[PDB]
Amino acid sequence: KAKTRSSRAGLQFPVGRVHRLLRKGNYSERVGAGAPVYLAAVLEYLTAEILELAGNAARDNKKTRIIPRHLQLAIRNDEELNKLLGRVTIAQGGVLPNIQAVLLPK
Amino acid sequence: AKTRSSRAGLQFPVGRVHRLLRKGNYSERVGAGAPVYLAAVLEYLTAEILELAGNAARDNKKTRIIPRHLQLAIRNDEELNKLLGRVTIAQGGVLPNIQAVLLPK
Amino acid sequence: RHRKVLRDNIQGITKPAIRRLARRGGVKRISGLIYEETRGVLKVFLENVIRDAVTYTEHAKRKTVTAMDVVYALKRQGRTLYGFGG
Amino acid sequence: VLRDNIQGITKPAIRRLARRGGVKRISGLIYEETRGVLKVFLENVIRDAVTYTEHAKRKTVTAMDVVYALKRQGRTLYGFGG
Amino acid sequence: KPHRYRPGTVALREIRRYQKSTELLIRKLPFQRLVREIAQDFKTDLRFQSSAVMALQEACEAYLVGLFEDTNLCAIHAKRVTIMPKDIQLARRIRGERA
Amino acid sequence: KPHRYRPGTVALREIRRYQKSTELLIRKLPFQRLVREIAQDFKTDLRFQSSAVMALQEACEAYLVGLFEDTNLCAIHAKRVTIMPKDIQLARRIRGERA
Amino acid sequence: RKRSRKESYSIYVYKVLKQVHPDTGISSKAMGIMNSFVNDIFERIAGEASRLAHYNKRSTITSREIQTAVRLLLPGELAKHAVSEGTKAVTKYTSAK
Amino acid sequence: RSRKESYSIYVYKVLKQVHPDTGISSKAMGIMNSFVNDIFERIAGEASRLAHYNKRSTITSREIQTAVRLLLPGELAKHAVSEGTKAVTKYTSA
DNA sequence: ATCAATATCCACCTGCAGATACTACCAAAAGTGTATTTGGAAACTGCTCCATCAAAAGGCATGTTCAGCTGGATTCCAGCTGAACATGCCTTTTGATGGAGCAGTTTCCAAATACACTTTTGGTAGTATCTGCAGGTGGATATTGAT
DNA sequence: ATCAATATCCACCTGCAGATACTACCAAAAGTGTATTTGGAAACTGCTCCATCAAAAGGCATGTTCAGCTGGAATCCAGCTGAACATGCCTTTTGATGGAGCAGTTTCCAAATACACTTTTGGTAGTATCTGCAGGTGGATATTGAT
Ligand SMILES: [Mn+2]
Ligand SMILES: [Mn+2]
Ligand SMILES: [Mn+2]
Ligand SMILES: [Mn+2]
Ligand SMILES: [Mn+2]
Ligand SMILES: [Mn+2]
Ligand SMILES: [Mn+2]
Ligand SMILES: [Mn+2]
Ligand SMILES: [Mn+2]
Ligand SMILES: [Mn+2]
Ligand SMILES: [Mn+2]
Ligand SMILES: [Mn+2]
Ligand SMILES: [Mn+2]
Ligand SMILES: [Mn+2]
């Protein structure tokens, strides 16, 4: 019986779809078999990383459902995700609470 | 045998531009007019820069264009400066420019 | 029939709206001349994105600007936007 | 003498760079500040350049390695290929 | 006898309020008219997906908020608490939006 | 009395001199020493094409000159003519290179 | 007439969410953000891999191109963990069949 | 050995059209080469995205044209589109 | 105003590094011609969703008054930073000299593509029922500002 | 400090939009197996150019002195801009409806690819002559700064 390439790789993200998107995307003449596996794993990993931190932000705000606000808090409060997505706008994400010290009353 | 470039009235290599498009993995297929159009655009933009650069050379009492002249031509031209806003020209230097508040008296 | 003429809608970007945006940006005090300056800056930004978006629309031979038209336009200008079909 | 390499980037050289940048007057703390910024710039570009070198299985950093590195850092450079 | 908060107290209260929330701060219908007016001047007889207008408003407000942040830093740099046109202009220059 | 130009006069002279020319302003060998040192931290036993180091110095000097321009505008914004660390820091922040 | 299929990473994003936060849900707008994110990073990596192949006159994008692209694109710790996950997934995939 | 292609002899040709009595140093020629390669990549890349966005497998002169409009500022774009259309019209009539 | 110390400019000259013009060689590239194939325009049209209308109402914009405190102007002076100059350290030069290793060539096989066939699945559609939390209320706690 | 006005907090609640659940259905996706092709690793080698070395030479960095003038601290005050209020407009909300035009399906040929074959060309390598301009000169005069 047939096992999927994802299961064979131990991945949740779809290896077959990633391979298809690579071939259709005009990135190169040929695509090695290991390329969609490696790529699917990285995407799956980065997703887990964001969801972990987003779920924590939801929890901090006494919520059980992640909304864009939680995704924004997770990304901007994490230095490496902030860097990776530094030129990205999260719709309905808002901004981090931040008041310049000199603006506070004495 | 007559070249596609001469056929299109161009100095820039149509055939080479076509080969470069095919091998660049830009798309599955390349239309016939595409490398002709692109070659013409590249030739025009080249002419525009050389014109202004040559003028910069003449203004500096020179007959040979050097990097400095290319920089002068581009930075002194609003649209070229915008097109190449994130580009560094080696040995180009900068435009003479002093903030007024720094001048004496 | 055709719609009423559209004009002077930049003034629909009101002073309290601009104040609100500045507050989210962490601004505490605002000069009176800021409001006209912001409108001019906003118009330039909008014009540039809309120009690119409509260009995508025209190339697809559509008469309707899509969310993707806008998303693509924002992307090529370095304002990548998530949440509308990226 | 035993001096760090970044300290080889001298005060007069930094002064000259500032002059071309149109700067008339310079604070004494600028020079150390500039060296730190310079080092970060080089670290970021060279890291990428060497990554290209390694991938090509080479031991020699080529100008194209550097040019490619500069482009993806958004510092496109004309005059050295590509 | 009537109660008055000092100048700046409410402004600070407003900063905390709006930095906590994510809702759009420009009125929906007037923004849509601006979009249609600008687009019309580029090309007549255009129609808009409603999500296209919303995508434009999300991007526009994010841009302006980000710009006011940099503008604020420029004002503070000059030992001011009040943002002025020249603060915006310096911010956009360094950004390379008018360099 | 012997001859002395006022402070600022020679500075302005140097500005005109170096904005006129295109030669690299950092000494070659010390820059080369710095490059090799940094690269050794990523990968040992490397060699460089001569043009590779030159590409790096052209890029690095163009970057610093551009940065000093923005830095200068920040100083002038605060009504100074002397550039300071906080000027460079503000410029880099608004550029998006930091913070 | 039938509306043609619109593919997304939703069911896969959802699976991963349940792994890291079993009792946590996600709104459709947030899922829209996540799908944009995956598409974005896909293109960034695939794009860098494409250039890298071309620079070295190779017609094939292998896991080695992907790995180098990951190192060029991702910041320190993210790159480290991504690479190990990618390497592990590949060696496991090949050790099968 | 091998051969290294560049745009040098074509750039030089164009130089003689616009400035018959003007030369160009090798370093300056290297910069022109970088310029041509850069703009090629930008235009081809945008044209590639355009085709992909519209689910087409072919890059035609129409994709090059829209790409030019997107990439070049006002007047440069106008003249570039004109020159491009001219060369395609002329190439067709031959 | 004068007047002296330098900086800066212009005209001219000459050595040479780098540009040129020449012949010749050749692989790769570009053209030409034929056979085959297929992407996508055209036609037709289903059906999503865009423009537009109405109508009620309250959230929010507008315009005003008032004065707190901010920005801008002035003054002052401590000291930092520019200018000048004396040393001498080390970058620069250049020219030769191994040899690292880039790069070109040949070999050949694991891994790619191509294809036919079969099974699996994620997307959509149709309804039908949970459920997290927005938003409203009330009342206790906290913050601000006058005194 | 006390106390009062007002914002802020949190617990509690309920309506419902939106998340969830399930069955049906199916085209596309994905996997399995077989045949055929080939990209690029591997080993070897030639020759490019990189590292190093010596060896002056002087250019340029560095340390020091002195004071001009800049940055920043302190003081004052006119009037900008924030806070609060009254008023009522126009955005928001809800819902309905025609039909523009986006998008699905099928047809079909102009233009794409794919080879084979022939011709042209750009890159090249020596080989030799040529020349634009850097760099040095003298001397005129412009600039700067002290009187
Ligand atoms: Mn109009
Ligand atoms: Mn077809
Ligand atoms: Mn009113
Ligand atoms: Mn008063
Ligand atoms: Mn003040
Ligand atoms: Mn060897
Ligand atoms: Mn299923
Ligand atoms: Mn609530
Ligand atoms: Mn082969
Ligand atoms: Mn003193
Ligand atoms: Mn001062
Ligand atoms: Mn119709
Ligand atoms: Mn020839
Ligand atoms: Mn000279």
Author numbering:
A (entry chain C): 13 to 118
B (entry chain G): 14 to 118
C (entry chain F): 17 to 102
D (entry chain B): 21 to 102
E (entry chain E), F (entry chain A): 37 to 135
G (entry chain D): 29 to 125
H (entry chain H): 31 to 124
What does the paper say about this structure?
In addition, although the crystal structures of unmodified NCPs are known, we prepared the unmodified NCP by a similar method, and crystallized it in order to compare the structures between the H4-tetra-acetylated and unmodified NCPs in detail, under controlled experimental conditions for sample preparation and crystallization. We overexpressed the unmodified H4 protein in E. coli, and used it for the subsequent crystal structure analysis. The crystal structures of the H4-tetra-acetylated and unmodified NCPs were refined at 2.4 Å  and 2.2 Å resolutions, respectively, by molecular replacement as described in the Materials and Methods. Overall, the two NCP structures were nearly identical, as demonstrated by superimposition. In the H4-tetra-acetylated NCP structure, the electron density corresponding to the residues from S1 to K20 of H4 (molecule B) is missing, which is quite consistent with the previous structural analysis. The main chains from V21 to I26 and the side chains from R23 to I26 are visible in one of the H4 molecules (molecule B) of the H4-tetra-acetylated NCP. In the unmodified NCP, these features are almost completely the same: residues S1–K20 are disordered, and residues V21–I26 are visible in the molecule-B H4. As for the other H4 molecule (molecule F), residues S1–A15 and S1–K16 are disordered and residues K16ac–I26 and R17–I26 are visible in the H4-tetra-acetylated and unmodified NCPs, respectively. In particular, the position of R23 in molecule F and its hydrogen bonds to E56 of H2A and E110 of H2B, in the acidic patch of the neighboring NCP, are conserved between the H4-tetra-acetylated and unmodified NCPs. The averaged B-factors from the three independently refined structures of the H4-tetra-acetylated and unmodified NCPs were plotted along the nucleotide sequence.
The nucleosome core particle (NCP) is formed by wrapping the histone octamer, comprising two copies of the four core histones H2A, H2B, H3 and H4, with the superhelices of a 145–147 bp DNA duplex. The core regions of the four core histones adopt histone folds, which mainly contribute to the formation of the histone octamer structure. In contrast, the N-terminal tails of the core histones, which are rich in positively-charged lysine and arginine residues, protrude through the DNA superhelices. Furthermore, the N-terminal tail of H4 is crucial for the compact folding into chromatin fibers.
